[PDB]
Amino acid sequence: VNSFSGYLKLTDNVYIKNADIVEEAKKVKPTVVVNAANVYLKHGGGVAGALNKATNNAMQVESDDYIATNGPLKVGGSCVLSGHNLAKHCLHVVGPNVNKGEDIQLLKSAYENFNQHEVLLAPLLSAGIFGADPIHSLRVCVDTVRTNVYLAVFDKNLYDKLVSSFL
Template structure:
């Protein structure tokens, strides 16, 4: 069952599932700085979207160098339902600046999607896989980003958090329900 929140004119949706199946203008990949998509969300995206995503990622790094933590790069989405993949580089849990870098990864993804004129974007729980961020902490950072940035968005109308597995979904639902309790909406 999806949960939704209305922040100004933006609908924020929580859903459990596979981000490669989401219909959105862009999906966000939880990436590493070299955009090598060898595991987790990144591997699933390349497997489903095709090798073009890895080739474009390699070209991006060859031209621009590694993507710093908290920053993003954009490629096409290959065979995915999305038009773009926004590769957001999150931090490893335990980094003293981790929350700030995670905040920037979410924020810069939203800003880039908005700059591209996109109406919808889907996020995974960035940095919660091999980078070890607890789901609850990731959700708390994501809420802070939403509350600080949503008023600046000109094009984005729908933000989806597509969470892989019941534990991730429950954690995000608990945090979003608590922090956005006055913003609930029907989906």
């Protein structure tokens, strides 16, 4: 039993809700919240910008120190940093950004990072301004992640489309 509430059940291990991931993280205070990161951990826009704003820029400060020490991530890769006021930990996962010309095939590798954590609150990787079809992101998710994932979908109309077309 966990403190997630109001999710539709897609599969044995994947649940989905029409919710703002920022407000959901503040309410649940999950163990792990997933960020839609880029390799530089530059959290300017999208989910990354929104999560970072909710931490009062503490996420960016921590991230810049991480990059200065370790260099960039790989597309498909991840790192675990603090969750600040939103969660215990933030798993920064780099899905491919189609709008940058990155290989959509790396989406499965990106989702594999989720399997290192028993329970996660997450957005649809590579969707939004990363340019991949959210329907495809949900499919790769369900077919890759074996741990318990709670997906927050921001847009109501997209949420409706994702559920009704899910096989």
